[model samples]
Target: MNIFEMLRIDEGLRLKIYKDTEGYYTIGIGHLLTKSPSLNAAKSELDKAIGRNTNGVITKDEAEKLFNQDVDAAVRGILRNAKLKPVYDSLDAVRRAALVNMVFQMGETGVAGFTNSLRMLQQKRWDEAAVNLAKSRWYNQTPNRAKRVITTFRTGTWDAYKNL
Candidate 1:
């Protein structure tokens, strides 16, 4: 029911580099290695974080470290945006988690782009917010996770954190 545990479920894990759903090089709990600029850069970063040469693979502990870093970035990013800051602060933990999960899937800026959705969320229009988000191509891309996150917002419950 915590963000850490929820993310472990949603993002899954990879001890080695693998392409994500969108075909980007990803590693260790949805960490995008493609953003590292080069494969060497990615491996070096991993080596640095893991405190040794890991070749192309990571240990469970190393993966957890990367996951935590990503989660922290998502948390800070969500609270950094002007629009989402207030909206995020006004909600209960479950709804707040929905925001965090969305930000993790996209980014803070990407989630903030859902103007109407954020509006409804800020106003505490739960179902209305759900309606707004459910209509998006975002929903189409990964409907299972999207629906779960949106439902968390609508229900203000930790149902998404269950059965994992």
Candidate 2:
């Protein structure tokens, strides 16, 4: 796939732009605005940073190392579990990517709470899956990113994929 399309950035390095009184940052792939260079360059950096290249795996330990925080073990724990894995893989790439962002923000336990949604997706109930994805307690809790993602998943289109 085209890296630009996969990461979803504009020509001017804008990708999933988020702003607050705190600061302005554009997010893409799995990296925050600061962790990435330009919008187009984020995924390559994240791929290397996440260490998904060398071992074809991304661990929470890697995330902790990249972010210099104590979150690696917890994120890795969620990825390592079979129950959680299925839910994450059930959605399309866009939705799955958004879910990863959500998990990154909320931790594994927070994501695991969507048991019904997970079950719906596992059963191939696409419509319900989309709704369930948006209904999470964390759906619109912090960043509006998750809500945008849900809208994209439900509609089969999102800003990220519009110009591509």
Candidate 3:
């Protein structure tokens, strides 16, 4: 529920297929539909999600299912990162979700590149973590989303940042 709410705004909800900023075929809350091995594979996945031939549209329930899968992927990928174990295990739900959000946006490899910021987070240096994130190219790419994620890290609480 928590992840759903934040992502609903961060990525926005869409009831139909559309091209994302990078021209990737996307649908159902930033779910990159073109990452499959083949065109049939991608279409099949969408068909299953929508429980039909996917007439270029999906219902709210279908979209929700896709969102759930995406969130699951993000959460599992983050948990598998050995270097993040200590930090993730010790962090609160808010901060944990923030990390997952990053992975969801940039994939695990991209998030893993934030070695210094991750180290600062593990050390419980909230300010340094925020500073480190603020200096990133990722921050410049999506300032609003980055700001909210950084706020979640700095505050250690989801209360205020959730509203942002």
Candidate 4:
């Protein structure tokens, strides 16, 4: 089967938002709801295209396109955020991907609120940045995911879900 078919099977195609196994609100094949404006815009566009008032099913093709657009926009947002751009650009690919994943999970604005972590990152204090990340509400809310990102920030390795 094709990649999209695999993704549909892996992510599960749904016409509307529903809680995932982790109890996180997700829609259209793994698009997590993090209050992302870009994601909202994409949904609005899809709604318009399919008739807002009608109970319509978002096609696999539409869902895939929207997912791709959302990810592209999130990456752009990470690159465009004034406070994050320099630090993100200075990191290696693994760390960069970690930051992108964080931004993807918590929206650019939400990630930007981690001032202490960002400050440490800006100064190239990797350990301090990781410590700051661990000391946040995000960590409290999602320890496993946060720990992976923190480890990436600290060790420059992309072990997002290796041990934990």
- Strongest candidate by lDDT: 1
Who is ahead in lDDT, 2 or 3?
3
lDDT at 54 for candidate 3? 79
Model 4 lDDT, full chain set: 0.68
Give one digit per residue, the lDDT tens place, for model 1 in 122-149.
Answer: 8999999898899988899989888888
Pairs with steric clashes in candidate 3: none
Clashes of 2: 1
- Give per-model TM-scores: 0.90, 0.48, 0.86, 0.69
Model number with the top TM-score: 1
lDDT of 4 by residue, 1-164 (tens): 22233234445668675566457546686676544445455556456644554233466676677667666777899889997888788877767767776776678998888887888887879888888789887889778667766877798764444432
- Backbone clashes counted, model 1: 0
**What's the alpha carbon RMSD for model 3?**
2.7
TM-score of 3: 0.86
Query: Candidate 1: which pairs clash?
Result: none
The residue-level lDDT of candidate 3 at 77 comes to 87
**lDDT score for residue 99 of model 4:** 77
